[PDB]
Design a protein around this ligand. Structure first.
Ligand SMILES: CC(C)(COP(=O)(O)OP(=O)(O)OC[C@H]1O[C@@H](n2cnc3c(N)ncnc32)[C@H](O)[C@@H]1OP(=O)(O)O)[C@@H](O)C(=O)NCCC(=O)NCCSC(=O)C(=O)O
Ligand SMILES: CC(C)(COP(=O)(O)OP(=O)(O)OC[C@H]1O[C@@H](n2cnc3c(N)ncnc32)[C@H](O)[C@@H]1OP(=O)(O)O)[C@@H](O)C(=O)NCCC(=O)NCCSC(=O)C(=O)O
Ligand SMILES: CC(C)(COP(=O)(O)OP(=O)(O)OC[C@H]1O[C@@H](n2cnc3c(N)ncnc32)[C@H](O)[C@@H]1OP(=O)(O)O)[C@@H](O)C(=O)NCCC(=O)NCCSC(=O)C(=O)O
Ligand SMILES: Nc1ncnc2c1ncn2[C@@H]1O[C@H](COP(=O)(O)OP(=O)(O)O)[C@@H](O)[C@H]1O
Ligand SMILES: Nc1ncnc2c1ncn2[C@@H]1O[C@H](COP(=O)(O)OP(=O)(O)O)[C@@H](O)[C@H]1O
Ligand SMILES: Nc1ncnc2c1ncn2[C@@H]1O[C@H](COP(=O)(O)OP(=O)(O)O)[C@@H](O)[C@H]1O
Ligand SMILES: Cc1ncc(Cc2csc(CCOP(=O)(O)OP(=O)(O)O)c2C)c(N)n1
Ligand SMILES: Cc1ncc(Cc2csc(CCOP(=O)(O)OP(=O)(O)O)c2C)c(N)n1
Ligand SMILES: Cc1ncc(Cc2csc(CCOP(=O)(O)OP(=O)(O)O)c2C)c(N)n1
Ligand SMILES: [Mg+2]
Ligand SMILES: [Mg+2]
Ligand SMILES: [Mg+2]
Lengths: 559, 559, 559
């Protein structure tokens, strides 16, 4: 009788759940799983740190709508990955962290095993579910559970512990075929009641000044034409969140993005679609909402998200496709939004964009560019070349890029997310490149970049069409903070370094851009090349403000 | 009334407990703490990732015997630091992680605060104690509790949560000076009973083939002359664990390190001093210990470490200085270890060292150095220049350096430790440089290096006398693994990159060493320059073996 | 300005969410909440132990479909309640545990506060969400979050921490009335996709030997006519799990309950409605299911329950009323189940029931009733008086009562549940009595009874129409285990005690039933009296078997 082992059953189980790519860092006890995966013809991206393989997995999940798979070693490697699993779960990104672990006998008696840790229990706060597969016969079911938990309900992270003993277990090929199965409909549709839809439809119909807020949950849903059809048929102004940019084109005529404060302050009804009323929306209270409670319609898959911050007048619980699809029919033939309202917002949008256009054309000294004229170059490129992933993180580098760089296609803008994480950059580039097979542009704050910078080599090693733009202002927010004591560098200062040289250290192409013309020429050549590039964009050290747009959240001493 | 605030009471409380240095990364809500720390005249080291600021804090704790302090932001930054705290606790290194956290009310209802996380509860598995200081009046007590918990008993990590709202609370200066206090005897001696020492003394006096095993707990204790006096007076052969190297000079004539397998297998009594019978010692069982239970004598401050893995015949619970001092007096005038035992080991040491000398003189082609002739250069340099910290990590780069590079001085060798962590390299360098004010050499596997490599810029930014030697073999264990499929790079491969160029991108000095002679000149020049340097040492891709010495711990397929 | 406080906002918030009843035990810091709850005109039931107040809350949640509310003190009282919350979550019973907690500042520094515990963090494994309301202004949102979390998705427990300092905070009455709100649609319908229903419909239409398995999730859903209509229209044989008894009347002609082993072993398609393929169903494998994978159809609100144990061919995710309604319409006009299948089962049902009738008429000596003739009396009484709650727990007392005592009405049988808990008896009685306003019979193993027996006094104190039948066989499973040593009582033995006398000690009516005729008169008189009664039913000590039906799950020595 012919035998197979744990390595193969696991490989077969992943493939059966439509997984063909893993991001990770090898080592004991899983190096030979990584190799065999590759030998089978599947893809393995080796990183320089598991955190970044983890961030890659998380955004592969967002883009594709099937969980990104990260593979790590035990204890220290697991720890690094689980930080990324935590981020995924917070952002509602389907992801599976697979980690090897040590001997149950020794771990459970805390005797000091190789890389000892109860990884299953340590993972619990950072994921939807944390499982362990102890036996070969249970791998198919174990992977089904993981995939299902990651993509169903509110998508998120799942941890799957793989004890070292799992892989060397053997079983007959015959009984293995018997156990292998493909889960049926692991991310099922969830349809809301007629009366939940009728209530939301009544709120919208009777609204005087409605706004729609599109969150990245709406973008994740992959029902772009449904969402666009709803906006366009209702004639309701809309506002995208950071990663919902491009869901509808950011230059769509009903976009009130460029007059956001006035839109949220003055609206009466606000339709949240896959967007949480969390810190990014000021918890639905305070000055940004006119110091009043709006009438909210909220469409979310997670029932207990409703009323999490403010009372929701019309909670619609289900998957965005099903809910939006029904709401559209409910509103079919109803009057479009008030022209005095939509025309007021559009007038303030035109004025604000003209003010931005002026700033983007402004002339700065060589090597002392600002956030407007440098990112105006990226803006122009992304308007002509929209089928490109835009990775973005930083403070000023983030907030100015979100404002300035218009996205015309959905799920292209990949950014710091719900936790405002510095560190997602290079991992995000690898996964975007891997899953799209298309170019990536990253607009990186220089401090932001240093959290994942060593992964430039990973990008070079796989010769990915990634162009990393460093907003090199020489620090955190600013590059010019005075020495606090004599000979002592301020804590916010960073070396205004030759990041272009670092890229060329690993076979990449490096550029320095001292002006918008240099930045444009370099960007066009880098993207055209299809090769790994870095552009060291020299920004005025004094051009940024403290914490970007969220300056007011800083705690300052008044004594 | 003259008011002070939480920022300043915290600053003062830390200083009262002899803290003058923090390692971290700034941001909301803790940037102005960092600023004010520096304005006061204390050191803040800003890093590129909080994890490396944390590894830095952990080894500062080891070297100094006073808690290394790491400062982070909430959720994502906290998480990065807590991975290092975990490592500190596992290694018994005193360390305090201070992190800002968000609004109690919003985090507790999970409404989606800015960087929302119950950081206090997430730290719990990764430290000795996890605390939160909520009120200004409790800062001095909170800091006392953290310092005592980190340094007393078995030393380790402590998390201290600092809500955003702590810092802007106010109090009168004479109220604050009333609360401020310095703890008495935060790491007290703990003396063992006379019968504990007599039981140990009896076993040693009756041993036919005794060995002493020194662990890093023994090194941490800073009683080097006392431990050396015990070794010499007793005549007992000794072996250092990785970081206990140099506690006694590695070329001490009683060292059995060059004959470890034989010593441990054939001994009858084994005296453990601050060394756990964990995976590094194969749990005191199996062929490493001649397939039998030795008579173990164990000195440890942790009562319940006793009998963790094998029965301990002479458990001695107390601090190592106190214990060793009593054991010495209990053994006064006793005959020295059997001369035919000490003679047998010495001969095998001489034989094996001579055999290693043969390999270190071996000649290799340009750019294809092996681990013996490359590290033979570092060996000679460290013998001539012993007062230098030696950071080390990797597989072959770690195992070969521990064997070849002799330490003559205590607490200089700083390595991957209990969890065999890749990632500790550049933080360890910063901390060693900071707390010693003397040079640092790092011997880095190239894979290992990539876990903290971006921190080269941090080393350059503070102009530290650090020399990074990259053992550049182009991969994990080996740099020559065949492409598993046409055009697909193996998972164990890395770019054989110009790490020298990367160093020079941030103002550091970079070198390529293709031969031992080039390595020698470069290392001598690098250390003598007193500046940040990186030597890219070109190692034969086929020179290393899988996992170095712990290759049998791999799980391999057979089916 | 007219002020209100936390006590009153909390009272008002609970009432706004349709809460009129709490079960608990008073003390610091929550006695005056209890008092004021009552002063307002709402019910507070004081118990003798918080655990039983909690089991009471859990079954009130099951019966009503709105969260049962338990109130406790900090640490020790909280802990007792949280054991019941754990049970609620495990059984999918909506329940809120409110507990007072101590001072944030003292608990967080672990200084030793009055009843010190991070109760929020200790509850986490035992509920769906663990929250803390810190501020008066967040009470209405906090209570909304708890009610939604408990009732939505898969229903379950929620912990709500109430620091001592919450209650004495104040706010203006018109501010409080501005914050107070009632959540819209806290338990929404969730409708499955048409293809989910069509896949299920296809399998049922092609089944040769279909069965439907009803679980307590189906009973909880309160769509009894709809589920009965499905069973009748399809002609499919059905089986109820313990607490699904009476969903359809147990004497329904399509019931296969009296032929369970054969039905499950020989079926081809098995339709699971609110029933998990857990230990109670042997995980869908082994000889119980003919050693094969059936084609499972499963209706469950929890997406990731699918494929938890065996592959589900037709997963239908959504609320059971919505799902069953669609499945019925999808099966309209389909032929009824194979008559030779339904005929085979019916014959075996008739045979086995006739065989059970033989045992129930059996004659035993005075004071040595068996489980068949004693429970045969309860069977006849419940057939004649079906609108009564039947609480049940024990081993033989549980298994024999589930077999013998037919339920004609839904949500009346209330038993040990998913964890096979001993202890739920007297709390279940109090809650059933409270929420139904109708009589309650408890059939208690004597061991089982002792876990909550002191609550007899609580039943008497509220003069509830509860009749406790103690199946008094003098022990665990059996009352006759030999003394293992001279003068030493066996561990399985109990005093064959005068539980009647115990009842009468608190003003209850007590009976001894030594024969079925005495049991009948006593039960008839007890229930008709409308007063608290206990019937001490004398059972043959040798009548029961080890663990009842789950005796093969015992671990026994063979060496
Ligand atoms: C919280 C927010 C959602 C709040 O939104 P706002 O910033 O107010 O709005 P936007 O960014 O959409 O737009 C900014 C302003 O420019 C306007 N705007 C937008 N687009 C345009 C165009 N095309 N033309 C002209 N003007 C425009 C818009 O109306 C706003 O002005 P007004 O109309 O005047 O309002 C956002 O700031 C955000 O997503 N931030 C993420 C921050 C983060 O995570 N940072 C990393 C951590 S920093 C950190 O942790 C630390 O420092 O420490
Ligand atoms: C577990 C161990 C303590 C076991 O010790 P050993 O390796 O057996 O002993 P040592 O390293 O002390 O010495 C190695 C051998 O060289 C001999 N030796 C030592 N010094 C000398 C000199 N000066 N001259 C000649 N010979 C010498 C010694 O007697 C041993 O041979 P014999 O006496 O003949 O045996 C050690 O391997 C260790 O500390 N490993 C850490 C590994 C690690 O953490 N790696 C990173 C993760 S790797 C990973 O995670 C992954 O691969 O995945
Ligand atoms: C917190 C305490 C240590 C505080 O000590 P005190 O109560 O102040 O002191 P003592 O109890 O020792 O003594 C009480 C007083 O009587 C005096 N005293 C003591 N002994 C004597 C004799 N023999 N003769 C005369 N007087 C005496 C003593 O001086 C005190 O008065 P003065 O000189 O005038 O001070 C104690 O109360 C305690 O241990 N409490 C435990 C409470 C508890 O856990 N209860 C259950 C929870 S109730 C609960 O949770 C809830 O209600 O809810
Ligand atoms: N298919 C889906 N249907 C409905 N809601 C979804 C779906 N996928 C994700 N969501 C929801 O979308 C939300 C994402 O919100 P958030 O991450 O705050 O977006 P943003 O930051 O852009 O506002 C979550 O509340 C999540 O439950
Ligand atoms: N001052 C001290 N006195 C006694 N024991 C100590 C002291 N400091 C640390 N220890 C103990 O020393 C041990 C360190 O062991 P370990 O980390 O396994 O060393 P190694 O890895 O070098 O063998 C721990 O068990 C710890 O409790
Ligand atoms: N309203 C509802 N609609 C659909 N499924 C539900 C509903 N309420 C509870 N459930 C589900 O019903 C199941 C109850 O199963 P279980 O407790 O195993 O029942 P039993 O023990 O009777 O077999 C759970 O899986 C739960 O998710
Ligand atoms: C994991 C983690 N650690 C720290 C932080 C705190 C932070 C927020 S923004 C930032 C860097 C901002 O400077 P950058 O150079 O990137 O952008 P710019 O304004 O253009 O100069 C840090 C360190 C966060 N959010 N996450
Ligand atoms: C956080 C973490 N993730 C992975 C690993 C697993 C590992 C152990 S050793 C190693 C690299 C070995 O290659 P290196 O180049 O450094 O040395 P050399 O043999 O001379 O070529 C890895 C990735 C560990 N230990 N910790
Ligand atoms: C909280 C808890 N602790 C222990 C147990 C274990 C147990 C299962 S059944 C049982 C008692 C069986 O005797 P009983 O008198 O009730 O019934 P009978 O067979 O007719 O004599 C116990 C103690 C469980 N399930 N829960
Ligand atoms: Mg910057
Ligand atoms: Mg290498
Ligand atoms: Mg009994």
């Amino acid at each position: 009788v012919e035998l197979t082992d744990g390595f193969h059953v696991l490989i077969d189980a992943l493939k059966m759940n439509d997984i063909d790519t893993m991001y990770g860092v090898v080592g004991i006890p899983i190096t030979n799983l990584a190799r065999m995966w590759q030998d089978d013809g599947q893809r393995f991206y080796s990183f320089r740190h598991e955190q970044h393989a983890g961030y890659a997995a998380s955004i592969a999940g967002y883009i594709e709508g099937k969980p990104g798979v990260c593979l790590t070693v035990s204890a220290p490697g697991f720890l690094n990955g689980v930080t990324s699993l935590a981020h995924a779960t917070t952002n509602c990104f389907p992801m599976i962290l697979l980690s090897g672990s040590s001997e149950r006998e020794i771990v459970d008696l805390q005797q000091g095993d190789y890389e000892e840790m109860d990884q299953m229990n340590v993972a619990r706060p950072h994921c939807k579910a944390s499982f362990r597969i102890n036996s070969i016969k249970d791998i198919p079911i174990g992977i089904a559970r993981a995939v299902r938990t990651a993509v169903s309900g509110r998508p998120g992270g799942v941890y799957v512990d793989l004890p070292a003993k799992l892989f060397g277990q053997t079983i007959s090929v015959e009984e293995a075929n018997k156990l292998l199965f493909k889960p049926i409909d692991p991310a099922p549709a969830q349809i809301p009641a007629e009366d939940a839809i009728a209530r939301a439809a009544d709120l919208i119909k009777n609204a005087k000044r409605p706004v729609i807020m599109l969150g990245k949950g709406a973008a994740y849903a992959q029902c772009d034409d449904e969402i666009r059809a709803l906006v366009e048929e209702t004639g309701i102004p809309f506002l995208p969140m950071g990663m919902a940019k491009g869901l509808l084109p950011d230059n769509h005529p009903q976009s009130a993005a460029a007059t956001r404060a006035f839109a949220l302050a003055q609206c009466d009804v606000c339709v949240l679609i896959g967007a949480r009323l969390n810190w990014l929306m000021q918890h639905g209270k305070g000055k940004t909402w006119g110091d009043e409670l709006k009438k909210y319609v909220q469409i979310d898959i997670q029932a207990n998200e409703m009323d999490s911050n403010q009372p929701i007048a019309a909670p619609v619980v289900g998957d965005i496709k099903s809910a939006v699809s029904l709401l559209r029919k409910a509103l079919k033939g109803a009057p479009k939004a008030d022209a005095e309202w939509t025309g007021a917002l559009k007038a303030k949008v035109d004025g604000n964009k003209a003010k931005l256009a002026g700033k983007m054309t402004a002339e700065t000294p060589s090597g002392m560019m600002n956030y407007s004229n440098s990112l105006g170059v990226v803006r122009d490129f992304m308007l002509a070349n929209p089928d490109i992933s835009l990775v973005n993180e930083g403070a000023n580098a983030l907030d100015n890029t979100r404002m300035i760089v218009d996205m015309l296609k959905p799920r292209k803008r990949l950014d710091s997310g719900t936790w405002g994480v510095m560190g997602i950059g290079m991992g995000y580039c690898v996964a975007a490149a891997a899953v799209t097979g298309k170019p990536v542009i990253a607009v990186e704050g220089d401090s932001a970049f240093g959290f994942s910078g060593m992964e430039l080599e990973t990008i070079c090693r796989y010769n990915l069409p990634v162009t990393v733009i460093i907003m090199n202002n020489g620090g955190i927010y600013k590059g010019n903070e005075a020495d606090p004591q004599p000979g002592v560098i301020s804590c916010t200062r960073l070396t205004r370094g030759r990041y272009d040289m670092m890229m060329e250290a690993f076979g990449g192409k490096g550029y320095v851009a001292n002006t918008p013309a240099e930045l444009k020429a370099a960007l066009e050549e880098a993207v055209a090349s299809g090769k790994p590039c870095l552009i060291n964009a020299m920004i005025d050290p004094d051009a940024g403000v403290e914490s970007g747009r969220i300056k007011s959240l800083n705690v300052v001493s008044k004594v």
